[PDB]
């Protein structure tokens, strides 16, 4: 045919319905990667060498291999042990493993970044590692990581468009379906791409209106 | 009281210190100049173990502190250290960036380290900002609040590492001022600066290095106007 | 079943072919994206206001917007037009458009990392600003975007991966491949990650030894 | 030759000058001191147009430059500028440093260019490192070579942005000296500096600065021993 748009106002609840997907599943996967990040920062700090081994290998492992091949290891791969995980589970699981990756290191990169004379001046006034994590570093940190962590879930806004191959009923999908009614793919996938990007400006903004209630 | 011996120190290949010794007693002011690559700020940094010999011995109080078999909290405690750039935390205002550690480290109670923090700040002339933050402090104020919070520990010594040298010229005389108040007090100083005039007026003894080694010291008046040694005049010819 | 990997040697043809194929498509993709990328910096630095708008805009769509829907987009979305274009023309396409913009802003960002300085003294030397950029600034500039080029290329043998679902036979759809004579997804995923792995550390200290040979 | 008139200069809501003149002629060596914040390089800075005046306008040889009615960069050819943070190129050796402008502003012959430069590199003692990149030059040694690099293009007037005070102590005298030799040869100069024994020594005026304005202005020795003002005195008294 040739384009036609308005065709496609009868399907805004599916566009919608997409979007809504497309917020949950992010916000579920950041909200635990966050979480897990954390406790996998922790074990690499660790004095214990197996640990850290673990948590460096976890990290390296996850951030240097593809999120999809993470997603399908999790939903294909399981098959063949009597394991049917659902489809939004089985994306939530690969999203929020590989956020945890990118989250432990965005930590350990916030802490590097606080000037070192702050640990320096702590310790020089009789205050231990302990104390002076607890009192003058971490602080610091946090306004080094939680600008870095907004942009972790922005990010992964348009990584969540994935769990669209395991037939999750995300964004991105409604353009199957859509399709399926109209045999149109373009001015569906159009009108996607245009939500993402207003979804990325609006957070974007909103970040930037963050860093400087901040700074 | 303290007693650095003989130490060496490495960064990679890079060779900063090459066997110094240095003996301070309680009450001197020790002032140790030289150019950069000289090893004076390194030398400093060992005497409370911020840099670690990689050979050779520091002493304070007469037990030795570079071999793990002490904790060193307690010894940092003895040894007070100002920073060329300040080193003040930002988001702790004027009065708790003093009372932080005595609080924390000494079990000192809010009221007796409030009264403390507050009269270190009208020593330093800074009672009109004990609520301020730091980025609203200019150079000289930055530094006299830094000391102010290392005295809130009641070191036994100081530690200067060029306390002036990052602060504009009209900034330089009152963090002097508060130094040389400290020496007259009786206060154990070790100083390394570029401000000779501190050590003119101050100091009891002069340390100059040069290439990783102390290679003379004496009086003020010894090393200003009396230099035996060659490396020693090159450098006063260039710096007076 | 249980896991069997030493059934897998017989694929090792498979995986080999499809490993190829994503340095292909990636090498490929990533070479028309700088060569892209250089022209649409170079477009958004014209004083001529309407192209400035049509490179900034063209980053920030492509950046702010998935490249799973571009994919999709190019590949079904032009379907409805009479256009059959292949996989393997369509992942190309997807991925140097992508690339394209990420390289626009990768050259903006090593121009300006060059020290105003630089620049000030250039001028001030009686230097046009063509002069400056010419002898001066550029040079310099390109110390500072090659290690970012080299990133963005093992970035990208990542991000190839999603050219699978569309049915190119890269690694990640190797699984698909073999799976269907074995009924065997993990082992198969597990040896692909450990493929793109091993890639991303190789190409990963291959890189500092770069960034390590110009400054 | 110089016509600095009425200048103001903003950053937002920062006002960095308000309302200064200034007037250099040829063979002056005028010296702008002050407290920092006083604006001193930022008036320094609109003399060649690297900062751009808010209001008041700046004549360079009695045609007016911020108008865009001009050729800047053959304003900027006759109008030195030497930087705090010297900004050697750093992929040109030293003696490619001081011959591409030359080469590719005034088409000057390459042979001719560099008979200029060995030239230049023997005038600041620097000779010896024609073919070294600057990440091999000590602080002086890389100011001198930018002094040598600004002098290939032989200005009528040169700019000084505090040439010093990025140096460390030992590496000062040696480029005050090359600027005093360019004084002794009588070159234009207006100098910003804290280096007073400099402004002494060879200075034709002492320009002193305060939030924005000239408040007091005279030689050398009027300013330094007979001040008028309330505030250039109290300045004076914390850096003299
Ligand atoms: N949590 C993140 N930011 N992940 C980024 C993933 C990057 C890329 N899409 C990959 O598959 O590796
Ligand atoms: N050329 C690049 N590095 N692109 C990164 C793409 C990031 C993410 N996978 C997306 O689709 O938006």
Redesign the interface.
């Given at each position: 045919?040739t384009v036609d748009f308005l065709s496609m106002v009868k399907y805004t609840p599916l566009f919608i319905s997409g979007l809504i997907m497309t917020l949950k599943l992010t916000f579920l996967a950041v909200t635990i990667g966050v979480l897990m990040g954390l406790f996998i920062a922790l074990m690499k700090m660790s004095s214990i060498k197996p640990i850290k081994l673990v948590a460096s290998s976890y990290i390296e492992?996850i951030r240097?291999?593809?999120?999809?091949?993470?997603l399908?290891?999790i939903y294909?791969?399981?098959?063949?042990?009597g394991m049917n995980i659902p489809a939004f589970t089985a994306g939530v699981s690969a999203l929020a493993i590989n956020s945890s990756a990118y989250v432990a290191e965005i930590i350990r990169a916030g802490i590097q970044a606080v000037?070192p004379?702050?640990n320096?001046?702590?310790?020089?006034?009789?205050?231990?590692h302990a104390?002076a994590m607890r009192?003058?570093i971490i602080?610091?940190a946090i306004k080094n990581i939680l600008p870095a962590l907004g942009n972790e879930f922005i990010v992964m806004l348009?990584?969540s468009?994935?769990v669209?191959?395991i037939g999750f009923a995300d964004l991105?999908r409604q353009?199957d379906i859509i399709?399926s009614v109209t045999?149109?793919?373009?001015?569906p996938?159009?009108i996607?791409?245009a939500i993402?990007?207003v979804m990325?400006?609006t957070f974007?903004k909103l970040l930037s209106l963050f860093e400087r209630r901040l700074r | 009281m303290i007693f650095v011996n003989d130490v060496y120190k490495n960064f990679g290949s890079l060779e900063v210190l090459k066997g110094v010794t240095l003996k301070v007693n309680k009450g001197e002011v020790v002032v140790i100049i030289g150019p950069s690559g000289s090893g004076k700020s390194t030398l400093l940094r060992c005497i409370?173990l911020?840099e670690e010999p990689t050979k050779g011995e520091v002493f304070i109080d007469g037990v030795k502190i570079n071999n793990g078999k002490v904790n060193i909290?307690?010894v940092?405690?003895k040894?007070?250290?100002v920073?060329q750039?300040f080193?003040?935390?930002?988001?702790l205002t004027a009065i708790e960036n003093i009372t932080?550690?005595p609080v924390?480290?000494?079990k000192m109670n809010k009221k007796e380290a409030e009264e403390l923090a507050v009269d270190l700040l009208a020593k330093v002339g800074l009672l009109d900002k004990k609520d301020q933050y730091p980025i609203k402090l200019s150079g000289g104020q930055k530094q006299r609040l830094?000391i102010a919070?290392?005295l809130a520990?009641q070191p036994e010594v100081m530690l200067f590492d060029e306390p002036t040298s990052a602060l504009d010229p009209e900034m330089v005389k009152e963090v002097l001022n508060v130094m040389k108040q400290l020496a007259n007090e009786g206060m154990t100083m070790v100083v390394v600066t570029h401000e000779m005039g501190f050590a003119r007026e101050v100091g009891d003894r002069v340390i100059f290095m040069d290439d990783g080694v102390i290679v003379e010291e004496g009086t003020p008046e010894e090393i200003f106007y009396r230099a035996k040694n060659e490396r020693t005049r090159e450098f006063l010819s260039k710096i007076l």
């Open positions: 045919m492992v240097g291999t593809p999120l999809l091949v993470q399908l290891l294909n791969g399981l098959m063949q042990f000037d004379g702050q320096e001046a702590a310790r020089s006034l009789g205050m231990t104390m009192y003058v602080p610091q348009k990584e468009a994935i669209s191959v991105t353009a399709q045999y149109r793919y373009f001015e996938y159009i996607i791409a993402y990007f990325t400006l974007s | 409370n911020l909290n307690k940092r405690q040894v007070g250290m920073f750039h080193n003040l935390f930002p988001h932080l550690a924390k480290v000494k830094a919070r290392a520990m």
